[PDB]
Amino acid sequence: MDHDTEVIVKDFNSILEELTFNSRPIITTLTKLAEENISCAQYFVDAIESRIEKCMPKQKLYAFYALDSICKNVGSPYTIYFSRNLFNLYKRTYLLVDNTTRTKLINMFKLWLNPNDTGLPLFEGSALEKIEQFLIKASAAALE
Structure with missing residues (x-):
């Protein structure tokens, strides 16, 4: 982790530490940082x-x-x-x-099944199936 990388990652972490409520400007700013610095993608994921x-x-x-x-x-x-x-x-x-x-x-999970009306699941079909089965066993989703 060189200089520029360490600076960017440290900044992302500082901003994330202020996310104590549903802040739109902070969420949008972190979203823009993620889109502009894909090279640091892994560190942003670990931080989150x-x-x-x-x-x-x-x-x-x-x-x-x-x-x-x-x-x-x-x-x-x-x-x-x-x-x-x-x-x-x-x-x-x-x-x-x-x-x-x-x-x-x-x-949030429901919209992961059809994000932005694209008709395609946001994440790997397997992760989503496991979450649904967990929700059914927790009396949180209807059995089939």
Whole structure:
């Protein structure tokens, strides 16, 4: 991680640390940084997942909204990287947050099935199937 890379990554991390509520300007700014610095894609992904793992219940959702915005507006390679840990990330988060936050996690998932009316799933079909099965077992989605 050279100089320029370390500067950019450190800045992304500082901005992410201010995401304590549903901030549109911060989410859009992180989205623009992701689109303009694809070379640092992997560090941005690690930063977002670590944030989700370490912060309080409420704040876990907004970090997930940053992930959602980047994946819907920028697309690859972010959609591919996040697909790798999406199930474990979503499940562990769901099991550690309140029920109102859970309905918002559920609606976010629904739009992942048909984003921007494209008719094509946002993430790997497998991750999404596992999440749906988890939701059914948690009485959060209708059985078939």
